[PDB]
Amino acid sequence: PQDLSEALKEATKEVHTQAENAEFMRNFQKGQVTRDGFKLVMASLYHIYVALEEEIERNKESPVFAPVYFPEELHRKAALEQDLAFWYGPRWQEVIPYTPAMQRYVKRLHEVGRTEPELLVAHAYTRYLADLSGGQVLKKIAQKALDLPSSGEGLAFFTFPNIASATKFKQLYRSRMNSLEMTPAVRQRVIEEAKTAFLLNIQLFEELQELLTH
Which range touches ligand HEM (CB under 6 A), out of 35-43, 71-79, 94-102, 130-138? 130-138
Comparing CB distances to ligand HEM, the nearer of 16 and 47 is 16
Separation of alpha carbons 163 and 183, rounded Å: 31
Select from 4, 7, 8, 42 the one that contacts ligand HEM (CB under 6 A).
Answer: 8
Give every CB contact of residue 71 below 8 A, 6+ residues apart in sequence.
Answer: 60
Helix 184-212 to helix 35-59 angle, to the nearest 10 degrees? 150
* Least distance (Å) between residue 1 CB and ligand HEM: 11
Q: How many residues bind ligand HEM (CB under 6 A)?
A: 14
Comparing CB distances to ligand HEM, the nearer of 15 and 64 is 15
Binding mask 194-213 for ligand HEM (x = CB under 6 A): ----x--x------------
Task: Please name which of 93, 86, 49 lies closest in space to residue 71, comparing C-alpha atoms.
Answer: 49
Annotated binding residues for heme b, written as ranges, equal 9, 16, 125, 174
- Contact set for ligand HEM, span 98-117 (CB under 6 A): none
75 lines the binding site for ligand HEM (CB under 6 A): no
Handedness of CA 71, 73, 74, 78 (dihedral sign): positive
DSSP string, 58-93: HHTTSTTTGGG--HHHH--HHHHHHHHHHHH-TTHH
Separation of alpha carbons 78 and 81, rounded Å: 5
Comparing CB distances to ligand HEM, the nearer of 23 and 54 is 23
* Least distance (Å) between residue 95 CB and ligand HEM: 25
129 lines the binding site for ligand HEM (CB under 6 A): yes
126 lines the binding site for ligand HEM (CB under 6 A): yes
134 lines the binding site for ligand HEM (CB under 6 A): yes
Task: Please name which of 154, 197, 161 lies closest in space to residue 38, comparing C-alpha atoms.
Answer: 154
Give every CB contact of residue 127 below 8 A, 6+ residues apart in sequence.
Answer: 48, 49, 52, 197
Q: Which residues bind ligand HEM (CB under 6 A)?
A: 8-9, 16, 19-20, 25, 29, 126, 129-130, 133-134, 198, 201
